[PDB]
Copies of this chain bind each other. A is one copy, B any other.
Amino acid sequence: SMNKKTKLIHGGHTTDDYTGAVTTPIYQTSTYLQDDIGDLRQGYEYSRTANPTRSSVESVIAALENGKHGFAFSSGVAAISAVVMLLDKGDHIILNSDVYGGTYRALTKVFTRFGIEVDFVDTTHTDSIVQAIRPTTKMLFIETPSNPLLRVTDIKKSAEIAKEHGLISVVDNTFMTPYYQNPLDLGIDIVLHSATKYLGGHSDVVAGLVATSDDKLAERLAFISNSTGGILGPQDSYLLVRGIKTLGLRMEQINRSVIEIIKMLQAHPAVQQVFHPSIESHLNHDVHMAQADGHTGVIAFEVKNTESAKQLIKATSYYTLAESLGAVESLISVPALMPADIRAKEGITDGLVRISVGIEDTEDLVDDLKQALDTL
């Protein structure tokens, strides 16, 4: 019963019971000696099946999401990939139309070849999920807020919709992190993250994390992980644990700057509109406040055209033009350039700019972006 900032330091198991080392040892090892045949010395026999450094980060994400079983994968895509392989051929899964672009690509071009049929639904309306549910629908996949336009979906209702129809509810909590949003506490079966983003938070790990409280769903995830082998390595597991330590402090510095930056974007004439769940005029803004304690650092705002966005990027000094988000350094991107009907259903327009607020000084970030907008 510790507070969130305390949970990030002592939640789970990140110490060495053997030597007392206050950080998780990095087990660069493949196999483990057995004193007697079949008798494992500490539960370990082969690192693909289980590795102590990986089990440590798996116990952390489980503790942060108030779950019971954690799983670490080589990438957030590998985590999503392992989750959908819970379904069989002829099975059916519903997602929000505005999922992360890589998620759309994986389910439409990879997993449809295996007999999994996919339906996309603007989940901002809860009952619209029920329109697309079939007697073969087994999974409801929610990504709130979405990438990169931050559409909010009612998690607590989607869980009830999933629970009623015998559906496996999944939430992609990458943008909110366990520090501000806990889908497992709202009835969801499985929560997953792209740990590449906020959790690692230092632009130096590609990883995915999955957590659940259901036993039999966990034994199925462990079976898929051990049989498809998309496991996170020990070195990356350790850097994940290390980065998670400062998640609360990083999110709070990010949230402070998000406040000041939004107030500047909404008052700058060179900006057409701003997209963020903290805005009262934003769609489903009251749903977000009911299910989340804070806000993501991804902000979307549209200038007039793509060429103005390229000029705006070249005018800044602290915003790094690159992919990914949630890092200590602020990142800037043009989602349209980094099919057209799906891109429009994701909210991506020309002149749409996505920023990821870092942990630099607030006034420095506001005045840098504002001075850049003055040139348009």
Contacts and interface: CB of A to CB of B under 8 A. Distances in A.
Interface stretch (A46-54, A129-137, A262-270, A286-294): A46-54
Given A44-B21, A250-B249, A236 B239 contact: no
Given A28-B205, A323-B45, A359 B249 contact: yes
Interface in A234-284: 235-236, 238-239, 242, 245-246, 248-250, 252-253
B20 A32 contact: yes
B40 A78 contact: no
Nearest to A86: B113
Contacts of A206: 30, 47-48, 51, 229, 231, 233
Nearest to A205: B30
A141 interface: no
Contacts of A3: 360-361, 363-364
Given A25-B27, A227-B77, A229-B208, A89 B105 contact: no
B34 A23 contact: no
A67 interface: no
B22 A31 contact: yes
A324 B29 CA distance: 11
A47 B360 CA distance: 24
A92 to B, nearest CB: 14
A183 interface: no
Q: Which of A80, A87, A327, A334 has the most CB of B within 10 A?
A: A327
B20 A42 contact: yes
B328 A31 contact: no
Contacts of A33: 15, 20-22, 320-322
| Interface SS of chain A | loop
B74 A106 contact: no
Contacts of A114: 88-89, 114-116
A22 B15 contact: no
Given A37-B337, A227-B102, A229-B81, A359 B9 contact: yes
A174 to B, nearest CB: 13
Interface stretch (A143-151, A155-163, A196-204, A339-347): A196-204
Interface string A187-231: 000000000100010111110100000000000000110111111
A318 interface: yes
A35 to B, nearest CB: 8
Contacts of A245: 202, 328, 359
A375 interface: no
B229 A74 contact: yes
Q: Which of A87, A236, A246 has the most CB of B within 10 A?
A: A246
A330 B5 CA distance: 12
Contacts of A338: 37-38, 45
Given A19-B44, A26-B28, A106-B228, 9 more contacts: A19-B32, A20-B322, A29-B204, A74-B78, A74-B232, A75-B230, A77-B227, A89-B114, A246-B328
Interface of A: 2-6, 9-10, 15-23, 25-38, 40-42, 44-48, 51-52, 73-81, 85, 87-89, 102, 105-106, 109-110, 113-116, 196, 200, 202-206, 208, 223-224, 226-233, 235-236, 238-239, 242, 245-246, 248-250, 252-253, 310, 313, 318, 320-324, 327-331, 334, 337-338, 358-365
